[PDB]
Design a protein around this ligand. Structure first.
Ligand SMILES: CCCCCCCCCCCC(=O)OC[C@H](COP(=O)(O)OCC[N+](C)(C)C)OC(=O)CCCCCCCCCCC
Ligand SMILES: CCCCCCCCCCCC(=O)OC[C@H](COP(=O)(O)OCC[N+](C)(C)C)OC(=O)CCCCCCCCCCC
Ligand SMILES: CCCCCCCCCCCC(=O)OC[C@H](COP(=O)(O)OCC[N+](C)(C)C)OC(=O)CCCCCCCCCCC
Ligand SMILES: CCCCCCCCCCCC(=O)OC[C@H](COP(=O)(O)OCC[N+](C)(C)C)OC(=O)CCCCCCCCCCC
Ligand SMILES: CCCCCCCCCCCC(=O)OC[C@H](COP(=O)(O)OCC[N+](C)(C)C)OC(=O)CCCCCCCCCCC
Ligand SMILES: [Cl-]
Ligand SMILES: [Cl-]
Ligand SMILES: [Cl-]
Ligand SMILES: [Cl-]
Ligand SMILES: [Cl-]
Ligand code: NA
Lengths: 311, 311, 311, 311, 311
């Protein structure tokens, strides 16, 4: 089989549609997600046209091998999609209506800057390479683009599934290629992060601040050092759940800034003890009394500045 | 091969049945489970009918390629099922008896709200897309729906395996789809959670309450801070075994509330020490004496309120 | 091809044999193991019979496609076995001798009650479904059941590989099914658990008991609380290496009981201290002196009781 | 089909090109990366030549099975590449133009010496073995070597994708092998390592140095020992993210040297206490006062020496 | 296709050769390694003899399906090898030259006794089963056995790749089997273990011995207990990187013995404090002074004894 010939000099229009059946496995570290969907293709092949009168059939079914099917591939897949042809239907004018069910692991980058309050646009790129005979161009049949209502992605809210109707036509290895951009808009469900990471992390920090109402250096050293260890435990936990970014993330900034607070609290605790030993507890008392106000204030201000910069 | 033709205008009824041989790999984080079962298909093809008196053979056996078999797929599978045809038998009237053995990874969401005292309903959705010639409709042959007695799912009690007899017929991409709902009812074996997570977590909490019978700030700071670290270790362990939910879970609520108890115990320990230093140990003594009663009481009440809200 | 016809009304006897070449990947959590073995099948097909004189050969070699081969499956496999036909030989009297080399992931439950001093019986179930023409029944050719001497299973002692000669015949979806039980008997190599888990765990517990020869509350609180943390670390390590059981395991019981010892040691340490502060160190001295004997005694007795209940 | 015959005694030149579509999964421990690219092959086969004017068709399109294609393999792949032929085009003169889309896991060693400030040269080796008829030789068509602009590798900057134009021709198992070297130049994005590993690690070390402004042995022991534990936590974290090297890495050297600092700080803390107990706090005071300067100075110098040796 | 016929009663000699292209993934816990190599096979099939005059070509090239190929398998593979036929060459006399490129996961046991100073002999066993017609026997063509210079195995030194020329011929399931032993000799690169596990582990141990120059029970309890925790952390790390052995390993012995040192140090620290409280610090002083010498001496001697027993 060869491509359908041009009546006039026109390129072949392959109408496409993707209908999500299932979406799963959004791997943050890998920046990948798995998809299970219907891929619909439609093109005109005059060679397959027939008269319904002499045939007695309004449609004609063909096996994939029997006819010419445009070679449609996904740009951003890990391995080539697992596809199973559902149905191939030919109308009397030779209009082919193809339908396959596929599953693929899509590689699409994520912006972690606002984690865990981030939204993402996942992309699925359809592509077709033009042949020497004729040029092949993709189009979106919006009637055949959608998603099942039950489509869920664990830990994410599925906003929309749409297609950028205008293809990106360009040359690659001395042949033209028509590229289409399907978009899955999702926003992270930040709920869990509050009682699991954020609040426990604030409690341990506030506990370190009780050292500002204590004169016992040994108790203070314990308070500040122990809580610092718990902060390291959470930092490590967070960095395990995320890839290494060339930028700072929101949570990453909060976490880093909290280290400075422990470092300064250690300095205060050290200073207060030194003065007490040098028989000048009145200076020490002033610093400790200031610290009780300064620490929550500077912490609250820095957090406002950060949230402002990030949102 | 093409679909069997309608005598009158009737849709084709494909009788289905799933018989579980094995169930395994219930992944809580992935919200998936693996299944190994028999899939039975039954439909009438008059073109295949014969005479039992003259043919001498009651049943005719065919190879998949030889006859028309309806394209039955699973909605909620990760990848398309691994299937092996066991047998195809044709009765004289042309009733076809298809039997395949398959294995598949089923994606079915889980409700973690009552963890680890939760029960789940796992779903397996069968589907058939109607052809242009005739409409195909699924039905449940309850005779051919079941499970082996030895079917086990590690850490779960298998309650039942049933099918919702009435299919969900609906239009999808200008064709009829017939969807069936097979249900696997399971309930979690919470036993282990008691000596592994619950009791150790209560012991460490109680140990922090011994600070209410001590005047040593340094010892108290150690008691409360150390036990708090062990609580963080268990919180992290629990969150590793669970996916990120947009809601609170039972264990999650208990764990979160316990943090507040440590935070308040630190406050009390701080307050008691401050008063002792300000040479007013009678006030301190009152607060500590109150704490000895208040802490177990408020803990026990809060737990009743929580269990009430969750069950 | 169709099944060999019955001379009299007899069922077809398929003689089976499994010869282990390799045993590996015993996953405790998954309750699975991988196997690489020879599967031998033998049955009589009169239609295949010949005369050695006329033919000039005493054996006939066919390709799988050429003859009727019984559809033998494994009940307890994750996915259908990876098989490669080694040879198919026909005797003049129509006795077929089939040999395949296969590899499969077998799902077989494990009894963790006596861990790490447990022995297991791994099962491999062979099955055959009867056809409408004739009934098929499995048998064990003990001459063709065995294992290579070099077969090893990391962290386990391979006791025996035997077959239960009498098949379990039963009805499934109105057809006779012949089930065979091949058994691999193994016992765990508990050696490692002594210097890795058991002894370190006893040392930390004994270290906590040095608090019984100390009057320093602050030092005691440190001794008891620190060692308790190390015990949590080991409990978590152990539970990672094991699945969630609806029963208690031997190690699990020891681990749980040790928690009670830390809890009581904390009480003693608290009591003693409280006394000293109330200016009554003679009572405190009595309790501490009792504890020095009581703790090792109650620990040693409880361990005898436990070992008795478990073995 | 057999290879195209030599006009004169010349070896067959297969022009090659690799165009990266996607690059992902750079596993540091495994020293592997996954690639998705176009593989282009061009050679000339006079048997396939035709007339442009007479035939009317400028280019003829064949199916892989129809013509002779050189057996091109990758040297450094884990498993043989997953390839799908996109197009085969024959010019009148008989120049074949082959194009496949492939995906493969490439095993290419990494130099960890400068981690996390390292750059790597990933290799992809193309190979062809000669046949008995004629010798096959590879060449690079630089016009068909490249990468998509959107090619990204998480945690790395993609510098270049080039080919060493001249093949490595050599004999292996008494036949000619023609090997080509495609190079992917990448440099690590060290940004993250600063707020995640480097800075937290320096803070805990500076905290240990506050022991130089304290006379409390008990507080010092806590300061130095606790911070040492946090340093062990980071060392373990780092070694989990890296393979075992027969050499020292930059981070590895910093980490190791920091251990010496804790060891010496413990000695100082021990020495200072011993003198204080021996009623000679003037000597102790001198050592502690020296330590306050010596520690940051020796640390800063050693780091300069190390960075010098490593860069 | 059937086996070639004997010309006297001789068994068929299949000459074999394995040429390593790549070796990777040496999994210590799984006791497996992955290999990518050429498998060369040579036997003579007189039925394939040809006159170059008539055929035109001096050497004929066949497709695997076209001719008889001896069924060669690997004994110790997890799953059957992934093979791709590179070439099948037939000389006029009928000598067949078969070349395939394969990849396989080889299961070969490891001796951990001297870890991390151990050397291993990895095995790859080739096997052939004799047919009823004629006996097949394997031979090594040493000219076709080797490895690429660039063959590397992360964390190991590749010593040699050789074959035991004499096959192991033996009966199995009433047929003859010809087994060949290919050996890959490797030795572990212990470098990393020194700054990563060994030295940090010694530093923490020595840090505890500073308790021998202190009279502060509270400080000593902290020193000894804290360092003990760090030792548990390293023990766990080490046991994660190793399988459970029925014997002791070198590192395992060192690690276990170090536990005894902490246990005895706790006893000394307890004893010293008890005497100090009983107002007899002169006895305490003697024990502590002895400990300062005894501990490093007994540690150094025990290590000599251990290294002696292990090497
Ligand atoms: C640690 C200190 C506290 C950190 C909390 C940061 C939350 C935040 O400020 O995050 C912001 C997000 C919403 O942002 P958005 O939907 O992306 O809006 C983008 C539109 N703009 C560009 C106009 C802004 O949070 C929330 O809706 C609720 C967060 C509850 C936090 C309770 C604790
Ligand atoms: C820490 C504080 C204690 C936590 C214990 C919570 C147990 C609980 O309250 O859980 C209750 C569940 C049963 O609930 P159900 O079967 O789903 O009822 C659903 C039916 N309704 C809707 C009518 C209610 O557990 C048990 O049978 C025994 C649990 C013993 C726990 C011992 C500790
Ligand atoms: C913590 C306290 C110590 C725990 C040790 C329990 C050992 C045990 O008691 O286990 C007993 C098992 C053997 O049992 P079996 O072969 O299954 O007997 C089955 C036959 N019956 C049914 C008659 C009982 O161990 C051993 O032979 C050696 C154990 C060395 C332990 C050294 C420490
Ligand atoms: C712990 C102590 C501090 C460690 C920081 C050392 C950084 C370093 O020393 O690294 C230096 C590298 C650059 O190296 P390059 O680009 O490969 O030069 C190769 C060319 N030659 C051969 C001519 C040298 O980093 C940087 O540009 C910025 C480092 C910021 C670190 C912030 C802290
Ligand atoms: C903790 C206490 C120190 C432990 C170090 C033990 C090293 C050892 O003793 O191991 C010895 C091995 C060599 O052994 P081999 O190559 O197998 O010799 C086999 C031949 N025989 C049987 C004749 C002996 O290491 C080395 O070449 C140097 C190791 C430097 C270690 C630095 C610390
Ligand atoms: Cl694709
Ligand atoms: Cl399916
Ligand atoms: Cl099977
Ligand atoms: Cl390849
Ligand atoms: Cl093999
Ligand atoms: Na302390």
């Amino acid at each position: 089989v060869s491509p359908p010939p041009p009546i006039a000099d026109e390129p072949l229009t392959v109408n496409t549609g993707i209908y999500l059946i299932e979406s799963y496995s959004l791997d943050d570290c890998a920046e990948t997600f798995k998809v299970n969907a219907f891929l619909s293709l439609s093109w005109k092949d005059r060679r397959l046209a027939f008269d319904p009168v002499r045939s007695g059939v309004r449609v004609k079914t063909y096996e994939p091998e029997a006819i010419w099917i445009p070679e449609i591939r996904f740009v951003n897949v890990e391995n080539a999609r697992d596809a199973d042809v559902v149905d191939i239907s030919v109308s009397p004018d030779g209009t082919v209506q193809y339908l396959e069910r596929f599953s693929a692991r899509v590689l699409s980058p994520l912006d972690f800057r606002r984690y865990p309050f981030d939204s993402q646009t996942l992309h699925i790129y359809l592509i077709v390479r033009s042949v020497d005979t004729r040029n092949i161009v993709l189009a979106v049949d919006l009637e055949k683009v959608g998603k099942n209502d039950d489509v869920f992605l664990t830990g994410w809210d599925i906003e929309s599934f749409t297609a950028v109707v205008k293809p990106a036509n360009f040359a690659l290895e001395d042949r033209l290629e028509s590229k289409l951009d399907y978009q899955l808009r999702i926003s992270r469900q930040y709920f869990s992060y509050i009682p699991n990471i954020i609040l426990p992390m604030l409690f341990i920090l506030f506990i370190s601040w009780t050292a500002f109402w204590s004169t016992s250096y040994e108790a203070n050293v314990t308070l500040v050092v122990s809580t610092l260890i718990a902060h390291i435990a959470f930092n490590i936990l967070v960095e395990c759940n995320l890839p290494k970014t060339p930028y700072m993330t929101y949570t990453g900034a909060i976490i880093f800034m909290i280290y400075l607070f422990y470092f300064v609290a250690v300095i205060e605790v050290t200073v207060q003890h030194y003065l007490k030993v040098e028989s000048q507890p009145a200076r020490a008392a002033s610093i400790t009394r200031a610290s009780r106000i300064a620490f929550p204030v500077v912490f609250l201000l820095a957090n406002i500045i950060l949230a402002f910069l990030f949102f």
